[PDB]
Amino acid sequence: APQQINDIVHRTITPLIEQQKIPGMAVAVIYQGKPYYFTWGYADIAKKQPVTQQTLFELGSVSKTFTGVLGGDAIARGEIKLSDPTTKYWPELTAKQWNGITLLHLATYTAGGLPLQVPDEVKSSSDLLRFYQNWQPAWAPGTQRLYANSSIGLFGALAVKPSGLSFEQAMQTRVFQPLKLNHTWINVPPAEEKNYAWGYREGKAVHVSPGALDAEAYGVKSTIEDMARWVQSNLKPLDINEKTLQQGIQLAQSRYWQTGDMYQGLGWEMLDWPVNPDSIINGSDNKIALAARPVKAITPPTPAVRASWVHKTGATGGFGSYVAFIPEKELGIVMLANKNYPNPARVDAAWQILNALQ
Ligand SMILES: CC(=O)Nc1sccc1C(=O)O
Numbered sequence: 050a051p052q053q054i055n056d057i058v059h060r061t062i063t064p065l066i067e068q069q070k071i072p073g074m075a076v077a078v079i080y081q082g083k084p085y086y087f088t089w090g091y092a093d094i095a096k097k098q099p100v101t102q103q104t105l106f107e108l109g110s111v112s113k114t115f116t117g118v119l120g121g122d123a124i125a126r127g128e129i130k131l132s133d134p135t136t137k138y139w140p141e142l143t144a145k146q147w148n149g150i151t152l153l154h155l156a157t158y159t160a161g162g163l164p165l166q167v168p169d170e171v172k173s174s175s176d177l178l179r180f181y182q183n184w185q186p187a188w189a190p191g192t193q194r195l196y197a198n199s200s201i202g203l204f205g206a207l208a209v210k211p212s213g214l215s216f217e218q219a220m221q222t223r224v225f226q227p228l229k230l231n232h233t234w235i236n237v238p239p240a241e242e243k244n245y246a247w248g249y250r251e252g253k254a255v256h257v258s259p260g261a262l263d264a265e266a267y268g269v270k271s272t273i274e275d276m277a278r279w280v281q282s283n284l285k286p287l288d289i290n291e292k293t294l295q296q297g298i299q300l301a302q303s304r305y306w307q308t309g310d311m312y313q314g315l316g317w318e319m320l321d322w323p324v325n326p327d328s329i330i331n332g333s334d335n336k337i338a339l340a341a342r343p344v345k346a347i348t349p350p351t352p353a354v355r356a357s358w359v360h361k362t363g364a365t366g367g368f369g370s371y372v373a374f375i376p377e378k379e380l381g382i383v384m385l386a387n388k389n390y391p392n393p394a395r396v397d398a399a400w401q402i403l404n405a406l407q
C-alpha cells in the first residue's frame with residue numbers, strides 16, 4: 050500500500066491487537082475506491098494457521114447489512130413493500146398485537162419490543178410461530194427502537210417468501226453472486242473449512258452455534274477480500290449493473306428513524322459526516338445488554354445521504370467485526386477479528402484510520 054495507508058493502519062492496529070489480546074485480525078482499507086489488505090496473527094492457534102486474505106471470519110451482526118440489502122432488493126423487485134403488514138407474509142400470525150406491525154418495523158427494530166434473542170428452546174418452525182404469537186409488545190409500533198435479532202431476523206425470513214427461495218438461496222443468487230462475493234457463506238462449505246478461522250472466547254476455540262433465524266440475523270461468514278468488495282458496492286451502488294440490487298443498496302442506506310445523532314437504515318446505521326468521534330465511539334455500546342430508545346420517524350425516509358458515516362458492528366461468541374464507510378469520500382474500512390473485543394475499541398481504531406486518510 051501507499052506508505053501513508055501502511056503507517057496509519059499499522060500504528061493503530063498493532064497496539065489494538067496487543068491491548069485486546071486478539072489472536073488474529075484482517076483489515077481492508079478502501080481508499081479512493083481501491084482496496085488495501087492487512088493481516089496479523091492466527092486463524093487457528095493450535096494448528097498454527099495464519100490469518101490470510103482467504104481466511105473466513107464470522108461476521109455476526111454485520112450479517113444484518115446483507116439482510117437489509119436483500120430485503121431492499123425484494124422491495125425493488127416489487128415482491129414486498131415495507132408498508133406491508135407482517136401478517137401479509139405470515140398469515141398464521143393472527144394475534145391482535147400484530148395489527149399495525151409492518152415489515153418496516155421488523156427491519157428497523159421498532160415493532161414494540163421484540164427481544165434481542167430468539168430463545169434457544171425455539172427449535173422448530175412451530176416453536177417460532179408460537180414465540181411470535183405469544184410475544185407481547187411493551188410499546189406501540191414505531192415508537193421505540195430495541196436492537197433485536199428476533200426483529201430483523203423475521204424481516205429477512207418474510208422478505209424472501211414471495212420469491213419462493215430459501216433465505217440462503219435468495220442471498221446467494223441475488224446478492225453474493227452478482228457482487229462476485231464468491232467466498233461469502235451462510236453455511237461454510239467443506240471445501241472452505243481449511244480457511245474457516247476459529248473464534249476465541251475465554252481462550253477456547255469456538256464457532257457460532259445453530260439457532261432460529263441465525264442466517265438472517267448473524268450467520269454470514271466472509272473473507273477480508275469479499276468484505277472489501279461489499280464496502281465498494283455500498284460506496285458506489287449506482288455502478289452495480291443489476292438494477293434491483295442497486296436500488297436495494299440505496300434503500301438499505303436510507304434513513305427511516307432517528308435516535309440522537311444516529312439514523313436507522315435496513316441493517317446499516319448512519320450518522321452525518323463529519324461525525325463526532327465520541328458520538329460513534331461511545332455510541333457503539335453493547336456492554337449494554339438492552340438499550341431501549343425513543344425514535345423519531347423520518348416521514349418519508351431520507352434517501353441514502355452521501356455525506357454519511359455508514360457503519361455496523363457485529364459479534365459472535367468468538368468473533369468481532371466492524372465495517373464503516375463514507376460514500377462522499379470513497380473511503381471505508383473493514384476490521385475482522387477472531388475475538389469479541391469491545392465495540393468502542395473497534396470504532397476508535399476505525400475513526401483514527403479514516404480520519405487520517407480523509
Ligand atoms: C434527536 C432525537 O433523538 N430526537 C427524537 S428521539 C424521539 C423523538 C425525537 C424528536 O425529535 O421528536
Ligand SMILES: CC(=O)Nc1sccc1C(=O)O
Binds near residue numbers: 109110267335363389
Ligand atoms: C450473535 C451472537 O451470538 N452474539 C454474541 S454471543 C456472545 C456475545 C455476542 C455479542 O454480540 O456481543
